[PDB]
Amino acid sequence: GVLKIVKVYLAVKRRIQPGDKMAGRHGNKGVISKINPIEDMPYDENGTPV
């Protein structure tokens, strides 16, 4: 019955955002709660923010 098929792709590229579910190796999940700015993050003695 089928006459002619067509197949299309789409390479969507999804960033990270609140809701995504990161997790380490030792079974400690967690849903990303907020994406801070560069300078609200606790900086150690030489400015390198965590």
Partner: protein, 230 residues
């Protein structure tokens, strides 16, 4: 009866380092000007960075040119970390043509007076075939902060081509900014502090020009308190 600080020596350690000091600070204003500057420099410095690339015979990012040894998905992730400082205009359109076997450093961009590349030892891609040839037309803009390609689409205005490869642009000439108030010493004053803003740019913006454009972003904003509207 107060004291006001003045600029002092700028120990330009390296090309991307700096150490600007603010000599005569009254007591108590050490951490007040520092952290009110570290939160301005790291946030709102106008820089320039690539906006959209365009290669000769490729249609989308996930292609793979013949002759080069990177997918196009990594030629854009290497341009995004390109540092360049236009002087005259607001935006440019660079160029890049090369042919032969050997790595295509950033120093092969066509030379203009205003545009001034800073890291000419950069690497962009490789060429690995005698009849290979790459020819792109990079773009450059001014701005601040960070504007991902998805959100710079709302102002697309009918981006007619299908050869335009959009890059995300993170214009900012600062990377990390420490600072540590310490015991300054005027000739006779029991307690005067010194601020030492150990900056670190990406070779783009002058240190003394940052602080003179991070103070007036504060001193222009405090007006709304000096005149309370009610």
């Amino acid at each position: 009866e107060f004291l006001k600080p003045r600029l002092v020596d700028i120990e330009q350690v390296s090309s991307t380092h700096a150490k600007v000091t603010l000599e005569p600070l009254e007591r108590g204003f050490g951490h007040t000007l520092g952290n009110a500057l570290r939160r301005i420099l790291l946030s709102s410095m106008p820089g320039c960075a690539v906006t959209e690339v365009e290669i000769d015979g490729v249609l989308h990012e996930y292609s793979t040119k013949e002759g080069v040894q990177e997918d196009i998905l990594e030629i854009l992730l290497n341009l995004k970390g390109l540092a360049v400082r236009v002087q005259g205009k607001d935006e440019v359109i660079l160029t890049l043509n090369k042919s032969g076997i050997g790595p295509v450093t950033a120093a092969d961009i066509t030379h203009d007076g205003d545009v001034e590349i800073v890291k000419p030892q950069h690497v962009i891609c490789h060429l690995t075939d005698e009849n290979a040839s790459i020819s792109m037309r990079i773009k450059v803009q001014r701005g601040r902060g960070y504007v991902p390609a998805s959100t710079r689409i709302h102002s697309e205005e009918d981006e007619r081509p299908i050869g335009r490869l959009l890059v995300d642009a993170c214009y900012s000439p600062v990377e990390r900014i420490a600072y540590n108030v310490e015991a300054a010493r005027v000739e006779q004053r029991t307690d005067l502090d010194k601020l030492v803003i150990e900056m670190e740019t990406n070779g783009t913006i002058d240190p003394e020009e940052a602080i003179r454009r991070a103070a007036t972003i504060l001193a222009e904003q405090l007006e709304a308190f000096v005149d309370l509207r009610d």
